[PDB]
Symmetry: D2
Subunit: 251 residues, 4 copies
């Protein structure tokens, strides 16, 4: 227990699914947490379901909103003190091949999945460097930052960008002794509310030709690797990709 003692974390898209599980385990391990999402109804209920305002609060923010990122860090500092930990988890998907992606779809997805992660990573470095916080930026990528999917063209682009941009940030932070690590987490298929709302999705994701374990994961599978990466347990890990995918990318 207390694996995140003293840590102050921002988790984008932390009001449902994977992000909510990360927030729940972060609080359980002693972190103070600010979760974000676009809808305040979901967000305020999510925060209250996890802990008191002394442990966890909600901040309404679209991760594509550059100016809002400043307000998000400001509000987290005011509530909890200097931010030590950022999980860039908010993301969207378009079910389109590259061939069939409209430019509006392309720009919308990249605004959230790529611009948003860049805005959070850039600001995180500027706010967390040189403070002795054992700071950690955890950028959510995907198995689809490693392998293509024919119907996830823009998603693939964004997750490949997050994968390699994070290595750049890791190196710069390491070479400059900033006390900031940057790593990526790559979930396979995980049982989320979106998955349960798509008839047949889970069965398709569980075929052995997709997930060799024959079933999909659960949100706490991603929460636990994020606890390790936020914790000083992982103080020598930077610039690395952490895959939790039921074997998807091993075949």
């Amino acid at each position: 227990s207390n694996r995140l003692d003293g840590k102050v974390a921002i988790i984008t898209g932390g009001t449902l699914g994977i992000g909510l599980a990360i927030a729940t385990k972060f609080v359980e391990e002693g972190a103070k947490v600010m979760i974000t999402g676009r809808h305040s109804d979901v967000g305020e209920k999510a925060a209250k379901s996890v802990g008191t305002p002394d442990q966890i609060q909600f901040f309404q923010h679209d991760s594509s909103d550059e100016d809002g990122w400043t307000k998000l860090f400001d509000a987290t500092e005011k509530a909890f003190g200097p931010v030590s930990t950022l999980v860039n988890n908010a993301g969207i998907a378009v079910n389109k091949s590259v061939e069939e992606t409209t430019t509006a779809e392309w720009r919308k997805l990249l605004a959230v999945n790529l611009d948003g992660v860049f805005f959070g990573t850039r600001l995180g470095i500027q706010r967390m460097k040189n403070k002795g916080l054992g700071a950690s930026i955890i950028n959510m990528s995907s198995i689809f930052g490693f392998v293509g999917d024919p119907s996830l063209g823009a998603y693939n682009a964004s997750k490949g960008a997050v994968r390699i941009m994070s290595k750049s940030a890791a190196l710069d932070c390491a070479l400059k002794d900033y006390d900031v690590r940057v790593n990526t987490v790559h979930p396979g298929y995980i049982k989320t509310p979106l998955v349960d709302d798509l008839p047949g999705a889970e069965e398709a994701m569980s075929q052995r030709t997709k997930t060799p374990m024959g079933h999909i994961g659960e949100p706490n599978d991603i929460a636990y690797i994020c606890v390790y990466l936020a914790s000083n347990e992982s103080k020598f890990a930077t610039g690395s990709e952490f895959v939790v995918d039921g074997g998807y990318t091993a075949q």
Copy 2:
């Protein structure tokens, strides 16, 4: 010889350096070539230096210009017939860490390096599929689509995006029997005019801790792998990354 017999190729950024070498070898192997760039002075001289208008022409185009991509394919079809081959080579770099990248720099680089490659790949699939051309899309990435560089944050993002987006397109084209392959080429450091204009750059790039061969490459090093990928010699290669880097990524 005649390794590209009958092929019709568009090469973006084909008026100098690597792109010009690709265009030169493509013409030598029997392809008809349309090269692009932003400046007509450079472009018309480059075309004339390689061959006659029956072999190679110039089309003025910024690869970030979505509507211009349609006009580029139209003009190439009018000159040479249906396009079989696209080399998405135009790209720019910003010498900034993620931390120090302005949003204007971020958007400018991504417009050329990511949006431009998406526009060309998407249009290429739509124009080249199902025509029996043995079509090939060659997306220029970089060693910096594999590894970070602390001073190339936005570049890293764009080249990681190109790397994985290209796998998505490769899979969709393969699964749908489009007769279009998509692969990425990843140059290491190559002696180009930009390199020769930066005092000390080549020596820095040639340190054994960067390039184990102790020297950088030349534009024809990238031309030759592009000839292989454009040719029916590589008819079973799709979704793959081809690295020509003097050992940079092997250590």
Copy 3:
């Protein structure tokens, strides 16, 4: 705490350095542990330094010894009950290029680093499958399972073999619902007794051109990722590579 409640672990080469740290943290998290090594003087002192015989014991064994692997699993079962967890950590290095490796050096290194990991993985699957133990095989690889080093030819061969052989085992175990996961851990440079016995080694390993963090790691850096992989926290992770290297492979 109790992150390894009920687990029974074998750690090869667990009497010094990284393996001893893994064993120490495993016991702290509630596992029962059998550590191995070739020298009983080191091994019995190591076990006693960590806990009582009810928590941790030593078994003298060279990991290249195929028949001894059976006796090792037998003795662990007798002391602690069915084995749930195997860390294949024992390994040796030869400071030779491929060109300068003698065949005797080649065979000696592969006997420990490759045959030994195969013997333990094969036996582990046979002993741990279908017992509801949440079983986990953690194969120690290296950054040198990803990148070459000109003076580690045989080592590179063995660590690349361990990396991909482990994916085969992961897939078979997943597809057959064996309740056995297989993953690899890839340390960068870690401060060990061998390192401290080589004058100048740590400084060389800490150059930014090798480790961007500017220093090497410590044994607990590898212990903590092994706790995560042995624990049911990582029940959806199989067939994956976990790198803890101070940024070495990110550039």
Copy 4:
């Protein structure tokens, strides 16, 4: 044409299938070739089918035979002059999971696929370095040097070892200015005599969940990438992996 002018090549396992196609294209591009295999009936017919003894000869040799490697290089030098090019292509497969691999199977496969490639690579460096030959060692790996297959445990081990050992050799040769490059080729499924002798194999290999192109390749697909790597066209490529797999590893 003449892409291998003046080159002198050894191709192991060059008497059937992929190795024979490599030998055929090498001769077509002007190389002198010594092919090997265990059976002289196959080997002498293969050589005669490709060219005259002035172009191509056969040498009977099991690639696991260390002393025979010396005799093989000696005989090639005597026939054709100093060897510039080595394709380590001979290899075998066992259809067994790690769990079900006998130690005899393990040692037999590794003797050919790993020891043999080490013996040829080590000797090749010693014989080809510092002679101004533009020397190239092409080590045949596999898609199964990248991803696991549950029924190819020992094969996976050997191909992962070849993949990373080759990077070590590439780096040492580059750093020491030996004028020797080392790269790996990774075929997907290819229509060979062994494949045609297994009922149902090709259909299984052609399922979209295995090969997205929906069919397997042919031996000339691997010959053409080997011509590029043997040729001075690839003089800046070393330490790299070249995949020709119909999309297998892209998903």
